[PDB]
């Protein structure tokens, strides 16, 4: 078993799961589509930057 | 000013490609194909063979 710790666990538990060699055989899929795109600008009235 | 829009999160709209924005989606991509696994056998060394 690959034992991990859910450090923000609310009371107490353990959860056993499965993860095969394949990405389709998962149980729950997390599919990133657009990842951490930075958007920057300035406000011309004050030139201060917004990020 | 054109709003890309979002689907209704309804399976029907997602499959058909219906969005509420300007552009209408061709189709819901392809993430893979999931097939039931083929079980193993118990072999036949547990009883005589005698072909």
Which residues are registered as beta bridge partners of A32?
Answer: none
A49 phi, psi to nearest 5 deg = -90, 145
Q: Is A34 on the interface with B (CB under 8 A)?
A: no
Q: Which residues contact A46 (CB under 8 A, 6 or more apart)?
A: none
Please count the residues of chain B: 51
A31 lies within 8 A of chain B by CB: yes
- Listed resolution, Å: 3.4
Residue A16: closest CA among A3, A6, A29: A3
Q: Which two tokens stand for residue A25?
A: 């055989």
- A23 to B34: CB separation less than 8 angstroms, yes or no: no
Q: How determined?
A: cryo-EM
- The rounded distance, in Å, linking the Cα atoms of A36 and B2 is 23
In the numeric block, the tokens 């189709």 are attached to B27
């Amino acid at each position: 078993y690959r034992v991990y710790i859910d450090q923000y666990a609310k009371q107490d538990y353990f959860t056993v799961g499965y993860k095969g060699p394949n990405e389709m055989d998962a149980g729950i899929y997390y599919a990133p589509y657009v990842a951490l795109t930075p958007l920057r600008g300035s406000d011309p009235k004050n030139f201060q930057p917004v990020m | 000013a054109e709003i890309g829009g979002d689907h209704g999160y309804n399976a029907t709209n997602i499959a058909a490609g219906q969005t509420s924005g300007a552009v209408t989606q061709i189709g819901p991509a392809v993430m893979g194909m999931v097939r039931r696994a083929i079980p193993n056998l118990i072999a036949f060394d547990i009883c005589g063979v005698q072909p």
